[PDB]
Design a protein around this ligand. Structure first.
Ligand code: A3W
Length: 834
C-alpha cells in the first residue's frame, strides 16, 4: 500500500497519472518508465552525497574583465557571522572555502552558508569561481556568510523500489458533430525529420459525420527502406483541419501492424505540436481516423573549385535552404564534409533517409566521426542537430554526446530549450531525455528547474504531457526524500494560491475596477490559508530563497487586465540580512511559457556579452508557468513603469522629456548615487534596445517598460500584452537622461551608441546560435508559427551576410529612426488603448 500512497504522491507532484492508459495505442510510455530506471539508479549511485546535499554553484569560466576591476587588491573580503559574533576576513580570489575556513579559525565540521539563502560555498573551487561571489562583485555588495553544519545526506536518501511496397488502408474518419457542406479527403505522408518521403491522397467525398473509403494507399517506398523514426502522418483537408501521426517503426524496432483508431488534433482558425506521436485525449469531442496496417526488420581528393563550392554552402546560415545540387555535393563528398563540424546539419539533411543503402552508408560515416568528437563544443551546432530536421537517433546522439561536456552552469543556461527540444524526439526514451535526467539528479539546482520546466508542459500541453510525465516521474524517484519534501511544499502553496487567484478573478470585473470588496475577499481567503499551508516553501524561480508566512497586510490585487495578486512573504531565514519581504506576482490569463522563453534568451544574451567582457545590466526576472495560463513572476523591488512616471507628473493621459530625470534624481540618495543611476540607465537601455531588436519585440508601450530607482531599466510582459513602426524604444525622456534633445550628441549618448554597436556585434558572432534558439522557441513556445516567414526575421536583423562596418552602420540607423520618431509611436499606443 505504501506503493499506492507513493504513486499517488507522485501523481500529485507531477499533475498527471503516468499509470493512466485511457489515451494510448501501445506500451511505449510504460516501456519508457522501465527503460529510465537504469539511468536513474546509475546516477543516484554515482553522485557524491555531500556534494549533492550542498550543491555549490560554480563556473570554470574566467572572471570577466569588468569584475577584476572591482578587485585589484588581489584580496576579497568575506564577513563571517555567528549569532552576534561577526568577524570580517579578507581573502584571495584563488582562496578555497576550506583554506579560508582554516584561515578564519586562525583568527572540522563547519561550512560557510550564504546569509539568508540555502547556498553553500564549498568544494575545491576558487572563491572567484562561485556565482554568488560573482553576483556580489557584480552588484557591489558584501559577501555575508554564516558558519553552520553541513546538511545531512541522509535526508537525500532514495526509497528502495521484406521487398514489398508499404501500404496502409484508410478505413474512414469519424466525428460526432458538424457549418456548410463541403468535400473532404485524407492525405497520408511518410515523414522523417520533416521531409516527406512519400505522399498519397484519397479521393474527395462529401463531408458527413462518418466517411469511409476503405482503400489501400500503396506507396513507392519499400518496407525495407523505412527508417527508424519515420512517421505516418495523416491529415484531413476540406484548408487543413486535422492531423495525427503514428510512428511506423515502434520502440522495439518493430514494424507497426494492425487496426488503429486515432483521435486527431484540430487546427485552430510549422510548430512542434504537429510532430507528436500522441493522440488527442478527447474521445468524446475528437475527430478520429480508422486505419489498417498489415505488413520485425533488421578517397579521391576533392578538386579545388568544388571545395570552394562546398565551403560557401557550409558558411550559410542554418536557415538557408539547400538545392538538389548542394545535397549531391555534400553527399558525394561526405568524407570531405565530415571534416567540417559546421557542415554536419547541412550534410545530414542531404541524406536520403528513405533508401536503406544510404542510411547504412551514413552510419558508417558516423563511425569515422573523429573530427566531430575532437571538436570544441559548439552549442549552435549541437542545438541544430536536436531540432525538427533530424529524426535519426544516431545523428541526434552525437549532439547529445557533445552536450555531455557541459558544466552545470552551462546546462542551467540552456536547460529550458533543451527540455523543449524533447518535443523533437521521435520516441519517449531518448539520449537527450536521459541526458536531462542525469543532470537533474546530479545537481539540485538543475533538478529543481528541470522539475518546474517539465511540470509546465505537463500541466498545459495535451500534446506532450504524457511523454513529459514519464520523464518527470523518473526524476522524482531519484532526487531524494528531501527534494520530494520540498517539492511537495511548493506544490501545495502554489496549488493553494492558484485557487485563491481563481476565486477572486471569478468575482472581478473586465474593466480596471479595484474595490475594498475585492481586497477584503482577497485577504479573507488568505486569512483562511494562512492558518494551516506549510510553514515554509522554496521560491520556484529562485531555489535558494525560503518563503515564510504571508504578510497579508502587504498583499493586494493588482489593477491589470486580469486580476493578478501581488503577494509579499516574510523570509523564513532568521539569518537573512533584512526585513524585506519576498514579493511574488501570481496570475491566471497569460501564457507564461512565452515569457519564460524570452527571459531565458535574455540570460543567454548576457552570457554571450560576458564572453566579450560586457555587462548590459539586463534584468531578466524570474518567471515560472505553473499550470494552464497560470504561474508566478518575481517582483523587482523599487521599480515602476515608465508610464506611471509620466502619469504622476503630466496629466493622467497623453508626454514630457524631462520627467524621467526628475524621477531619478529625486529617488537618488546622493549625487554619487544619482550619477550611478544614469550610468546604469545607459547600459540597460542599450541592452534592452539591442536584445529587443534582435528578437523583434522592440515596439512596445510604456506601461510595459520599467525602471528601478537605481536606474536599471527593463522590459516586462513578453509574449505580448499590447501589440508607423519603431525598431525599439529610444524615447525623448530616455535621450534626456543621457543628455540630449533634438539631433545633438552627448558624452553619454555617445556612450550609449558605441555600447549598442559593441553589443550588436557580439551577438552577430553567435548568429547561428541565436537563429536556432529563436526558431526553436517559435516552434515550441508559440501556438503555431508559419515556418519560413516568421523565423526569417532574425536574419534580417542579424544582418546576415554583411561585414561589421555595415552592421555597425545599420544599427546606428535604427537609432536615428528612433531619434526621428520621438513620441509618435508611443502616442498612438496610448490612443489604441484609449
Ligand atoms: N505576463 C506578464 C504579466 C504581468 C502582470 F502582472 F501584469 F499581469 C507582468 C508584470 N510584472 C510586474 N513586475 C515584475 C518585475 O518587478 C516589478 C513588478 N509588474 C507588472 N505591473 C502591472 C501594472 O502596474 C505596473 C506593475 N506586471 C509581467 N508579465
Amino acid at each position: 500500500e505504501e506503493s499506492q500512497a507513493f504513486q499517488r504522491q507522485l501523481t500529485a507532484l507531477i499533475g498527471y497519472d503516468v499509470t493512466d492508459v485511457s489515451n494510448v495505442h501501445d506500451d511505449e510510455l510504460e516501456f519508457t518508465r522501465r527503460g529510465l530506471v537504469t539511468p536513474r539508479m546509475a546516477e543516484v549511485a554515482s553522485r557524491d552525497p555531500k556534494l549533492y546535499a550542498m550543491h555549490p554553484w560554480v563556473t570554470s569560466k574566467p572572471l570577466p574583465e569588468y569584475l577584476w576591476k572591482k578587485i585589484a587588491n588581489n584580496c576579497i573580503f568575506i564577513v563571517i557571522h555567528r549569532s552576534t559574533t561577526s568577524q570580517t576576513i579578507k581573502v584571495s580570489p584563488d582562496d578555497t572555502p576550506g583554506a579560508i575556513l582554516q584561515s578564519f579559525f586562525t583568527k572540522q565540521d563547519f561550512v560557510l552558508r550564504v546569509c539568508g539563502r540555502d547556498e553553500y560555498l564549498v568544494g575545491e573551487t576558487p572563491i572567484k569561481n562561485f556565482q554568488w561571489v560573482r553576483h556580489c562583485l557584480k552588484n557591489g555588495e558584501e559577501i555575508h556568510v554564516v558558519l553552520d553544519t553541513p546538511p545531512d545526506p541522509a535526508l537525500d536518501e532514495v526509497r528502495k523500489e521484406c521487398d514489398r511496397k508499404f501500404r496502409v488502408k484508410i478505413r474512414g474518419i469519424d466525428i460526432p458533430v458538424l457549418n456548410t457542406d463541403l468535400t473532404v479527403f485524407v492525405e497520408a505522408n511518410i515523414q522523417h525529420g520533416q521531409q516527406v518521403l512519400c505522399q498519397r491522397r484519397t479521393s474527395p467525398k462529401p463531408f458527413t459525420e462518418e466517411v469511409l473509403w476503405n482503400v489501400w494507399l500503396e506507396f513507392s517506398i519499400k518496407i525495407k527502406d523505412l527508417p527508424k523514426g519515420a512517421l505516418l502522418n495523416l491529415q484531413i483537408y476540406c484548408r487543413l483541419l486535422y492531423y495525427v501521426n503514428l510512428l511506423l517503426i515502434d520502440h522495439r524496432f518493430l514494424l507497426r501492424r494492425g487496426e488503429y483508431v486515432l483521435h486527431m488534433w484540430q487546427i485552430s482558425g510549422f510548430n512542434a505540436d504537429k510532430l507528436t506521436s500522441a493522440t488527442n485525449p478527447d474521445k468524446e469531442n475528437s475527430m478520429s481516423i480508422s486505419i489498417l496496417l498489415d505488413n520485425h526488420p533488421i578517397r579521391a581528393e576533392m578538386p579545388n573549385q568544388l571545395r570552394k563550392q562546398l565551403e560557401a554552402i557550409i558558411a550559410t546560415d542554418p536557415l538557408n535552404p539547400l538545392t538538389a545540387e548542394d545535397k549531391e555535393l555534400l553527399w558525394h563528398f561526405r568524407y570531405e564534409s565530415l571534416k567540417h563540424p559546421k557542415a554536419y546539419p547541412k550534410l545530414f539533411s542531404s541524406v536520403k533517409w528513405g533508401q536503406q543503402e544510404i542510411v547504412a552508408k551514413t552510419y558508417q560515416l558516423l563511425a569515422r566521426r573523429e573530427v566531430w568528437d575532437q571538436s570544441a563544443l559548439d552549442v549552435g551546432l549541437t542545438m541544430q542537430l536536436l531540432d525538427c530536421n533530424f529524426s535519426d537517433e544516431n545523428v541526434r546522439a552525437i549532439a547529445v554526446q557533445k552536450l555531455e561536456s557541459l558544466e552545470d552552469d552551462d546546462v542551467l543556461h540552456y536547460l529550458l530549450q533543451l527540455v523543449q527540444a524533447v518535443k523533437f524526439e521521435p520516441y519517449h526514451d531518448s539520449a537527450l531525455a536521459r541526458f536531462l535526467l542525469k543532470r537533474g539528479l546530479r545537481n539540485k539546482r538543475i533538478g529543481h528547474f528541470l522539475f518546474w520546466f517539465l511540470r509546465s508542459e505537463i500541466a498545459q500541453s495535451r500534446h506532450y504531457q504524457q511523454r513529459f510525465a514519464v520523464i518527470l516521474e523518473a526524476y522524482l524517484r531519484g532526487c531524494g526524500t528531501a527534494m520530494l519534501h520540498d517539492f511537495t511544499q511548493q506544490v501545495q502553496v502554489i496549488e493553494m494560491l492558484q485557487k485563491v487567484t481563481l476565486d477572486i478573478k471569478s468575482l472581478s470585473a473586465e474593466k480596471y475596477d479595484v474595490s475594498s470588496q475585492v481586497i477584503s475577499q482577497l485577504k479573507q481567503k488568505l486569512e483562511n490559508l494562512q492558518n494551516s499551508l506549510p510553514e515554509s516553501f522554496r521560491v520556484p524561480y529562485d531555489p535558494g530563497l525560503k518563503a515564510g508566512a504571508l504578510a497579508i497586510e502587504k498583499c493586494k490585487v493588482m489593477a491589470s487586465k486580469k486580476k493578478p495578486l501581488w503577494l509579499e512573504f516574510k523570509c523564513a531565514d532568521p539569518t537573512a540580512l533584512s526585513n524585506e519581504t519576498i514579493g511574488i506576482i501570481f496570475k491566471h490569463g497569460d501564457d507564461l511559457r512565452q515569457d519564460m522563453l524570452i527571459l531565458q534568451i535574455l540570460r543567454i544574451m548576457e552570457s554571450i556579452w560576458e564572453t566579450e567582457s560586457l555587462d548590459l545590466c539586463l534584468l531578466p526576472y524570474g518567471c515560472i508557468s505553473t499550470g494552464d495560463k497560470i504561474g508566478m513572476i518575481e517582483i523587482v523591488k523599487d521599480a515602476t513603469t515608465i508610464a506611471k512616471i509620466q502619469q504622476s507628473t503630466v496629466g493622467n493621459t497623453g508626454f514630457k522629456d524631462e520627467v524621467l530625470n526628475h524621477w531619478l534624481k529625486e529617488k537618488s540618495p546622493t549625487e554619487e548615487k544619482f550619477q550611478a543611476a544614469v550610468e546604469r540607465f545607459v547600459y540597460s537601455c542599450a541592452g534592452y534596445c539591442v536584445a529587443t531588436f534582435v528578437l523583434g519585440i522592440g515596439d512596445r508601450h510604456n506601461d510595459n517598460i520599467m525602471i528601478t530607482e537605481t536606474g536599471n531599466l527593463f522590459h516586462i510582459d513578453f509574449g505580448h500584452i499590447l501589440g508607423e513602426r519603431v525598431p525599439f524604444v529610444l524615447t525623448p525622456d530616455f535621450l534626456f537622461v543621457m543628455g540630449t534633445s533634438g539631433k545633438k550628441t552627448s558624452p553619454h549618448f555617445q556612450k550609449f551608441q558605441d555600447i549598442c554597436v559593441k553589443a550588436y556585434l557580439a551577438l552577430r558572432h553567435h548568429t547561428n546560435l541565436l537563429i536556432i534558439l529563436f526558431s526553436m522557441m517559435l516552434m515550441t513556445g508559440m501556438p503555431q508559427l508559419t515556418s519560413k516567414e516568421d523565423i526569417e526575421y532574425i536574419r534580417d536583423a542579424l544582418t546576415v551576410g554583411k561585414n561589421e562596418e555595415d552592421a555597425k552602420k545599420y544599427f546606428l540607423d535604427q537609432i536615428e529612426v528612433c531619434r526621428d520618431k520621438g513620441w509618435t509611436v508611443q502616442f498612438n499606443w496610448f490612443l489604441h488603448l484609449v
